[PDB]
Structure 1
């Protein structure tokens, strides 16, 4: 039986008046969005930040992801030496990514329906006959090659028409990140992270450290498909995860288990866990709420930026 897409999470299209401050905006939509775990925010049509990373020198070593690593658990000869991590440029990764997807589906990359990639992704995760391997540029600090948003740190040129985006509250470098505590006063910081995706590259189910919010922006490229679970269902999801996990992993601390918590959304739904989905397209924000479990994968070559923030 083929994958059944979860219902769509809310999408908001604020006018310019409502698009003033992200914390005030998220506070207003919270009564609805906290009940779906994730939501999507489309900025006003005329809000188009330039892309401001150092593209000429952009280089990275993406992690290798084997889609069915879990279903193949329960030894193959020379396991552990399948594929080495190597260095790409932004350009050379994109050539590889588009070639992979167009080859895989036998059609131009921009013509593959989002629902077809979604169906194939979940089929491959559980398949013991097809061993698909992809790569994910997922460990890239904005401090390395700069943020995708313009930043007024004097390291890179900003045009007059771009200064607005350097100062915008929706620029992820201008989100509040400091958690309130007494230790924070007794002590004598965080920056955005970047994600360069290809078709089928993915993030497993997790919640943020300290149950933090996160905000996520897709700078350009093909969509990022998301699944989210409201915080009221967090303990339920955790129970399902431990019920259906391999016993070798069921007892592991959550912070380690989250490295390998791959689970088809339909399985959670059949166990009574509410799941919502969305395709985040270029120029759109996704916000995750405190203790909202989420997971997802990329439809093709794309570039995202994300940060944890505090309210």
Structure 2
């Protein structure tokens, strides 16, 4: 009955020499990592970038996420107004997030096992008897309050010991983003995610089947699921069979806004799925056309960007 965790995706711990160039390292791990869709990369222990966002002015209105909204399609009074609108700071969002999780599980937030949050998340997504609603500070542009990484744009002070991170190839602002094309001759910044427990992102691939790289600056883990690109059509077939019929005729760009699916459903239909808990200071790389989804274990802060090889 309970959720069965998928097998773990690969985790790499590159040496300082291997960590010098990200594209070179990603190219070398590709024979394994492209067979799992996602992989996790732990930087050397001494690689600890500062957090460079404008914290005092960081303000946002997160999106409301009803975990069982797809199951609820199977109408409620005054639907469309089920939640009051609240703006947060980083501090007040974290206070709300910690209070939600500790109240939900009746224990301190860091004492909740990651396996329990995972099992509860997937139970709540399919539950009609229990309507859990959370909030996600998603798709916050790094242009609003700055990137989480230090950047030498003369908009924020950079200490001397922080300059190496402003210049690092693993700084998401220094990843290559310009795709080659003939139109580029005739004629892209990172996004931020402030998570709370159960906030989530559903199955999707990137525009132009791009790679993506994801960094968890701080907080509780982000739980990932990934499908290798050689099974992309298998996943899409399972979606065609079991996703809500009302959304069946929708293009992929719109379908991937809403369509959540339990990883066990994909696995029972022969789709390979891998998981990982991305912890603070760790990278997750998604490979071209690798479907991925996930949810946050608690209050955290992530940064993501598509990159080109």
Same fold by TM (over 0.5)?
A: yes
1:47, distance to aligned residue in structure 2 (A): 0.1
Distance 1:256 1:110 in 2: 36
Provide Cα deviations, 1:54-94, integer angstroms capped at 9, x if missing partner.
Answer: 00000001000000001010101101111143210000000
Contact 2:70–2:259, Cα closer than 8 Å, also in 1: no
Contact 1:8–1:278, Cα closer than 8 Å, also in 2: yes
Distance 1:206 1:80 in 2: 25
Distance 1:211 1:87 in 2: 34
Aligned counterparts, 1:251-270, within 5 A: 251-270=249-268
Contact 2:198–2:298, Cα closer than 8 Å, also in 1: yes
Distance 2:261 2:278 in 1: 20
Question: Which residue number corresponds to residue 203 of structure 2?
Answer: 205
Provide Cα deviations, 1:106-127, integer angstroms capped at 9, x if missing partner.
Answer: 0000100000000000000000
Distance 1:78 1:31 in 2: 52
Distance 1:85 1:144 in 2: 20
Contact 1:62–1:139, Cα closer than 8 Å, also in 2: no
Provide Cα deviations, 1:227-265, integer angstroms capped at 9, x if missing partner.
Answer: 000000000100000100121111110000001110000
Contact 1:204–1:258, Cα closer than 8 Å, also in 2: yes
Distance 1:279 1:249 in 2: 30
Distance 1:254 1:237 in 2: 12
Aligned counterparts, 1:269-284, within 5 A: 269-284=267-282
Provide Cα deviations, 1:268-294, integer angstroms capped at 9, x if missing partner.
Answer: 000000000000000000000000000
Distance 1:118 1:310 in 2: 32
1:224, distance to aligned residue in structure 2 (A): 0.1
**Structure 1 portions without partners, runs of 5+:** none
Distance 1:303 1:18 in 2: 26
1:139, distance to aligned residue in structure 2 (A): 2.1
Contact 1:64–1:84, Cα closer than 8 Å, also in 2: no
Contact 1:204–1:261, Cα closer than 8 Å, also in 2: yes
Distance 2:30 2:120 in 1: 33
Distance 2:159 2:56 in 1: 19
Alignment partner of 1:72: what SS? helix
Contact 2:67–2:131, Cα closer than 8 Å, also in 1: yes
Taking structure 2 as the reference length, the TM-score comes to 0.99
Detail structure 1 runs of 4+ shifted over 4 Å in the superposition.
none
Question: Which residue number corresponds to residue 51 of structure 2?
Answer: 51
Q: How many residues matched?
A: 309
Alignment partner of 1:218: what SS? strand
Distance 1:86 1:244 in 2: 35
Taking structure 1 as the reference length, the TM-score comes to 0.99
